[PDB]
Specification:
This is IA-2beta60. Glycans are attached at residue 55. It is found in: Cytoplasmic vesicle, Secretory vesicle membrane. It is classed as hydrolase. Keywords: phogrin, IA-2beta, protein-tyrosine phosphatase, transmembrane protein, diabetes, autoimmunity, Glycoprotein, Receptor, hydrolase, ferredoxin-like fold. This protein is an alpha+beta fold and 89 residues long. It has a single domain, classed as Protein-tyrosine phosphatase receptor IA-2 ectodomain (Alpha-Beta Plaits, 2-Layer Sandwich), CATH 3.30.70.2470. The chain is built from three helices and four strands. The chain has helices at 14-28, 58-67, 69-76, and strands spanning 3-7, 35-41, 44-49, 80-85. It has a four-stranded antiparallel β-sheet, with helices on one face. It is globular, with a radius of gyration of 12 Å.
């Protein structure tokens, strides 16, 4: 299951997307090493959460981003415009 966060930065630079992911990881007390395959596509950063000691999943990541959007925006200096989880065709 791939998670994503769409921002108001475009193109969102690989480093900015990485810092945003480490921001959310800090909120969940998971190491950023639990975030695999981190990518930026256009305005979005996407990532997979691998099995970790906090039992945190991709949905937990989504929920934590929603629940802390304001803190995350102030931390990161950008706007979060959508969060969710991807689907395969």
């Amino acid at each position: 299951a791939r998670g994503y966060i769409v921002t108001d930065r475009d193109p969102l630079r690989p480093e900015e997307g990485r810092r945003l992911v480490e921001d959310v990881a800090r909120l969940l007390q998971v190491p950023s090493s639990a975030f695999a395959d981190v990518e930026v596509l256009g305005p979005a950063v996407t990532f997979k959460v691998s099995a970790n000691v906090q039992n945190v999943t991709t949905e937990d990541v989504e929920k934590a981003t929603v629940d802390n959007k304001d803190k995350l925006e102030e931390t990161s200096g950008l706007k979060i415009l959508q969060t969710g989880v991807g689907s395969k065709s």
